[PDB]
Design a protein around this nucleic acid. Sequence first.
RNA 1: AUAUAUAUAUUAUAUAUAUA
Lengths: 113, 113, 113, 113, 113, 113
Amino acid sequence: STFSSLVIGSNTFIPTAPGYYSLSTRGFSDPRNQIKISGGKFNAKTGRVTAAVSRLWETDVTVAGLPVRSAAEVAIIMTLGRGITATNADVLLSDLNTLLDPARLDQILQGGF
Amino acid sequence: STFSSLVIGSNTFIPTAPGYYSLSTRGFSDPRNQIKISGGKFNAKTGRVTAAVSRLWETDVTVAGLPVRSAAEVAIIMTLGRGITATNADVLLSDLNTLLDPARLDQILQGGF
Amino acid sequence: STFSSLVIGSNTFIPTAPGYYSLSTRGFSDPRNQIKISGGKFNAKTGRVTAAVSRLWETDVTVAGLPVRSAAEVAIIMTLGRGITATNADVLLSDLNTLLDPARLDQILQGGF
Amino acid sequence: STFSSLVIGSNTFIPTAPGYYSLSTRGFSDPRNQIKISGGKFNAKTGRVTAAVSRLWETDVTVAGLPVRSAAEVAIIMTLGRGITATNADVLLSDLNTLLDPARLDQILQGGF
Amino acid sequence: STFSSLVIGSNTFIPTAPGYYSLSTRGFSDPRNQIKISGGKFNAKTGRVTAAVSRLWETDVTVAGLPVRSAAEVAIIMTLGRGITATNADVLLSDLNTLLDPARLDQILQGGF
Amino acid sequence: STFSSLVIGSNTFIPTAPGYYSLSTRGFSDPRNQIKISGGKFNAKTGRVTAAVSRLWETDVTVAGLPVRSAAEVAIIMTLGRGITATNADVLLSDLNTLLDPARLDQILQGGF
RNA sequence: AUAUAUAUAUUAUAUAUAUA
């Protein structure tokens, strides 16, 4: 609703459902490729604001000879006390995306502590 | 202590607690600056692996004229089905980091759908 | 029966069953391509005449590796109070067709409010 | 909310209520001129997505010597099985609008089969 | 997000939450400076439309030697019967703004009947 | 009681009832044109003061051929924490009256969010 | 008689399509 479109490089996401922005290429019965945004929740009790941006992707892969549609969800959840800047948030996120290369991800996905 | 250390640019994080890595500069009384990794959860019931990497940062900031220590937490939660690659995950995460610039982050944190 | 045939562009629909007009080409085992008209109903309680023109199209597509025939139905329903012209109705219909392009339709099918 | 505004020819419709887009000119006591969109509903049982776009227009006409406000509603209802494109739907809609001219519409409103 | 932006002199308000527009300068941790619009409620029972526009402003001020963040909210509630124009409303509102200068505002806030 | 009269341009309002100031032109059985002031309420619990100034106007309009007296009420409600100035109030009010022109009022009165 | 779907009013009212 509040964003007219979300652009990432070449890819352009149009808003479909409340909180939902799906790729312009993808049809309605095509595998989902989208972004979910729920944000701005704030309670005086915690003094902290909470928001969440999820990236959801589906791909058709043949596993054990059977074509199945597999899902993949990367959800970011932000909890920021008063005094924190959106810039602080992007810095922490950037730190995490730098930290997660496919090496460490394969190792963490099988159990890396 | 699967990872001996986590390096992000110049910043180096040493392991302290199980799945906890904090910056080498900081003290224990100093505000927290750290990374929590708990990953690798798999059930063949759903064929889905689930992992989480969290970034936690505290800063001493003056808010409305009063000195306060505030917390900021960006948590990534990955839920991947069979046949999704760690490369797919880094792609989706990179998409999210590119999407979240401070402008959109602020809009969403103030309530953006 | 009250329409001898319905011409739409290149295609010509002949009546088969009461209120049914299918494409002249199709054989009986071919997928259905038809128009269902039923209208003129008036109840004194509401003072509203009501009419409907449905369009039904089937196509053979492979889904989940199985060749299957799926359907697609677009139904227009007109409810008009005393003092409305058929021209008022064609104006409203034209408005809706100008409004619904494939992009907006995909959006609405994926959950558009 | 997912559409900032709907332009149709000269006229421009702004959203007022969830799923409602009325003409920007009209005041609150003026007759209603609006579009009602609600769609995206999918049930696994039928494998059919269903959506609806209604057009609602009221006008003030004297009937039986009494000035009365009467309504006129043209509702499009889309039911699409797996493997249909939004382009398939716009084609069917265009077919119906080409088909329905005022003459045929008057005929159908007066009882056309 | 019916209104893409609210402009008042030099100040520009962007939409954040449903019916919420905050100044483009401010951050989420920064004090609130915003406009809440919730309007258009109509029942034919009373023939009365009801709408509300609120202005919310926070400032960090030292009070009795202690730094405090204080809130200030001016809320307009319009209740209009059939046949009242939006022009009538702006006239009445302009009357109220002309009437409330700081002298009378202070007198009334200290208890003026 | 506390104000001897309220003057707005050419128009002069005399106090009639406690909290009530009606136009000097208007008789007692004439349509109401008045200002209601209730103000100064302050509780230590909230720390905030509340006041309210309403503008009430009635006009005779023929609707559906029947002459009816329609009401119109624009109420301002102020809630100001300690540290706020009456000048701050007039500024916020002035912002609102600048923001509400007949364009945006007609659009909000039919539902603008 | 069964199944599916849309719109109006504060559970009720109106309407379309598929199957026996």
